[PDB]
Amino acid sequence: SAKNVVLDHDGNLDDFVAMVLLASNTEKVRLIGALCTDADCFVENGFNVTGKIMCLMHNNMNLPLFPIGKSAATAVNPFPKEWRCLAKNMDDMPILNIPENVELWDKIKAENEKYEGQQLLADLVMNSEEKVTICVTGPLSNVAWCIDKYGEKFTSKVEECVIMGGAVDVRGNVFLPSTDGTAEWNIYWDPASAKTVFGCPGLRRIMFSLDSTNTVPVRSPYVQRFGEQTNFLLSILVGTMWAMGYYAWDALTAAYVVDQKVANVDPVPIDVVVDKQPNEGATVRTDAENYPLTFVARNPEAEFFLDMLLRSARAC
Amino acid sequence: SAKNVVLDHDGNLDDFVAMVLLASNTEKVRLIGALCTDADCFVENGFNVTGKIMCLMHNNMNLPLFPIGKSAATAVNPFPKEWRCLAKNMDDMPILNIPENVELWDKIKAENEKYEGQQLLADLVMNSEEKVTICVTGPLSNVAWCIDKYGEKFTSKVEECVIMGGAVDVRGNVFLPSTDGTAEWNIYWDPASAKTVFGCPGLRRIMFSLDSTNTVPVRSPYVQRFGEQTNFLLSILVGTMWAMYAWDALTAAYVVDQKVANVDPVPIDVVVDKQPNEGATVRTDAENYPLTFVARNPEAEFFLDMLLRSARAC
Numbered sequence: 368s369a370k371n372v373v374l375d376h377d378g379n380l381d382d383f384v385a386m387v388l389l390a391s392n393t394e395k396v397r398l399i400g401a402l403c404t405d406a407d408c409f410v411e412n413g414f415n416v417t418g419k420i421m422c423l424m425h426n427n428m429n430l431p432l433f434p435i436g437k438s439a440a441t442a443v444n445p446f447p448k449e450w451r452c453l454a455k456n457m458d459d460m461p462i463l464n465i466p467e468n469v470e471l472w473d474k475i476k477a478e479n480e481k482y483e484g485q486q487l488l489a490d491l492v493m494n495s496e497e498k499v500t501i502c503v504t505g506p507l508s509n510v511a512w513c514i515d516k517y518g519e520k521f522t523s524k525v526e527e528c529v530i531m532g533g534a535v536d537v538r539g540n541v542f543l544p545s546t547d548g549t550a551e552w553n554i555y556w557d558p559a560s561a562k563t564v565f566g567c568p569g570l571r572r573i574m575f576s577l578d579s580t581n582t583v584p585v586r587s588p589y590v591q592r593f594g595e596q597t598n599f600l601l602s603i604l605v606g607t608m609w610a611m612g613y614y615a616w617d618a619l620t621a622a623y624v625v626d627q628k629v630a631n632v633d634p635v636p637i638d639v640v641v642d643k644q645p646n647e648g649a650t651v652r653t654d655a656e657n658y659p660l661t662f663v664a665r666n667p668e669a670e671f672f673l674d675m676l677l678r679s680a681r682a683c
Numbered sequence: 684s685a686k687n688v689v690l691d692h693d694g695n696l697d698d699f700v701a702m703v704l705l706a707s708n709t710e711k712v713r714l715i716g717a718l719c720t721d722a723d724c725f726v727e728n729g730f731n732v733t734g735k736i737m738c739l740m741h742n743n744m745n746l747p748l749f750p751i752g753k754s755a756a757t758a759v760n761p762f763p764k765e766w767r768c769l770a771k772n773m774d775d776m777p778i779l780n781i782p783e784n785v786e787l788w789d790k791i792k793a794e795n796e797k798y799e800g801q802q803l804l805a806d807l808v809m810n811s812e813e814k815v816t817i818c819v820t821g822p823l824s825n826v827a828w829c830i831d832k833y834g835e836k837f838t839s840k841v842e843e844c845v846i847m848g849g850a851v852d853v854r855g856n857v858f859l860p861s862t863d864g865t866a867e868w869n870i871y872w873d874p875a876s877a878k879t880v881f882g883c884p885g886l887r888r889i890m891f892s893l894d895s896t897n898t899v900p901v902r903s904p905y906v907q908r909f910g911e912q913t914n915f916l917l918s919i920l921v922g923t924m925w926a927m928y929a930w931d932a933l934t935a936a937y938v939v940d941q942k943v944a945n946v947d948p949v950p951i952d953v954v955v956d957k958q959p960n961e962g963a964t965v966r967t968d969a970e971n972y973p974l975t976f977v978a979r980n981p982e983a984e985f986f987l988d989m990l991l992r993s994a995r996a997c
């Protein structure tokens with residue numbers, strides 16, 4: 368009884384760990400598509416790594432193929448050049464370049480190159496028989512576009528939108544000379560889109576803000592445990608990615624989609640600062656009457672998540 | 684018969700690929716030891732990666748263990764912190780943390796933690812029955828130290844010093860506000876030590892300067908070829924390191940097989956003052972100045988195939 372999930376990511380290392388988490392848990396998740404945004408990555412690399420990962424999994428665990436599209440979304444405020452992916456680095460990793468897998472990817476690559484990521488998101492949600500859960504690990508530009516373009520026809524088909532983004536009762540992570548450090552990168556990348564998303568009535572939202580993700584730092588000892596599973600392709604993959612502060616922001620978010628025990632949620636009316644102020648991009652509690660609620664993750668089960676990841680990485 | 688070789692490195696990615704090359708070619712190289720310098724890495728991480736690589740190999744093919752020492756050499760001009768952390772990353776790679784191998788490392792770690800890199804180098808060379816080839820892939824502080832402390836007693840025991848460093852007819856790679864870009868990093872890190880080494884009489888030196896290493900850039904299509912060999916631990920290791928020029932690897936390849944390149948005798952001096960061209964390796968006309976055999980036109984394809992083949996040792 369797996370639910371349909373679409374992954375809307377921006378190709379960084381944790382976006383790919385999130386992908387593995389979602390794809391590996393076939394009992395709970397049926398991954399029907401993914402789109403990559405040119406934010407915290409260079410979209411072509413992110414697109415290719417997504418396909419290489421999908422093909423490796425298809426040939427080793429019977430994971431069904433799914434469409435992958437590149438989003439045309441553009442930044443309001445660009446991610447730092449440095450961080451913009453080791454996705455280029457991941458594209459040359461040996462584990463993602465096994466002939467049988469690379470050959471299959473090259474066979475279906477052309478048709479996926481044809482999709483427009485944003486439309487792909489809209490179509491997968493609207494045309495699916497059952498409702499779709501959207502896992503957003505990059506900026507909210509794509510979900511916002513779908514809301515602006517299809518409205519209720521889109522939102523009514525969304526089971527829930529599980530979002531990695533924001534900072535509610537803690538500091539953010541955007542520290543530039545012109546910012547005060549209260550905003551988080553995914554929101555800051557496109558504040559207006561984030562606002563559209565958080566204020567959309569009739570869209571159920573689960574939000575993994577830094578309040579919860581801060582409890583899961585990526586530490587060496589834990590990362591080295593993937594060394595106990597080198598006979599599993601997914602452990603070489605996940606371990607290598609994490610081997611390269613840093614938190615499992617996107618991974619925690621995806622873990623929740625797999626099993627809601629990862630964390631409890633509490634309703635909070637969320638607005639986003641779009642003006643060019645030092646706190647531009649901040650997700651704040653609004654007093655507006657009848658403002659829609661967003662379910663913010665709290666007290667995530669850290670141990671549970673970490674063990675879930677290590678276990679999922681033994682899928683194949 | 685294999686020749687005795689000691690790897691004197693500073694823990695960056697190519698340092699480790701060089702180590703794999705030397706270690707995998709048991710027919711040509713008998714790797715009797717290694718030392719790690721806190722230069723292009725943080726020594727502790729460099730130390731641990733060296734050990735993990737050695738134990739990974741020892742547990743999967745015939746390769747005797749050898750002593751690994753931490754050098755106490757300190758920089759004159761440090762590498763940008765950015766590159767130094769790469770050893771930390773490799774230290775957490777899954778292929779280097781397989782339990783049986785880590786346990787082996789944990790088991791022999793005590794014996795190795797007590798060595799002083801510079802002294803271990805002096806000892807391995809001088810106590811060897813045959814002469815020893817030194818493969819230097821980091822700064823020349825350690826060889827200089829041995830020369831400074833033992834002179835002829837040390838050099839007379841060196842078959843040859845194969846060095847990755849300098850730039851002769853091409854531009855360097857040290858681009859900083861205070862420099863003019865004619866210098867190469869390994870030399871720049873410690874110019875004085877380099878001067879002692881390159882001006883040392885009775886020391887045969889083979890030098891892989893940027894002039895030759897520039898002709899072997901690390902390319903994606905080639906790096907992806909390791910994906911054809913995932914059944915080999917060494918291919919997972921090498922491909923992973925190059926995915927995230929082959930300076931040091933070319934230098935070690937030469938040690939395995941000198942067919943990697945022809946060499947030309949050039950009298951090489953080093954600029955030591957704190958000027959913009961500090962650390963540059965410059966040709967000198969001084970009478971009776973010692974010669975250094977500078978590598979030229981390295982066999983690129985031969986080198987790329989040797990590495991691919993070597994990565995299939997296990």
Ligand SMILES: O=c1[nH]cnc2c([C@@H]3N[C@H](CO)[C@@H](O)[C@H]3O)c[nH]c12
Nearest residue numbers: 379381450504505531552553616617
């Ligand atoms: O230092 C960093 N390197 C790479 N990505 C991120 C991010 C990205 N932004 C989100 C967390 O702020 C999350 O989706 C992650 O992929 C924040 N900081 C870094």
Ligand SMILES: O=c1[nH]cnc2c([C@@H]3N[C@H](CO)[C@@H](O)[C@H]3O)c[nH]c12
Nearest residue numbers: 695697723766820821868869930931
């Ligand atoms: O951009 C870089 N990343 C990592 N290492 C180096 C080096 C180091 N210095 C030597 C080549 O200049 C070589 O031993 C290598 O380990 C130069 N540039 C870089």
Ligand SMILES: [Ca+2]
Nearest residue numbers: 377382504505
């Ligand atoms: Ca992300």
Ligand SMILES: [Ca+2]
Nearest residue numbers: 693698820821
């Ligand atoms: Ca080096």
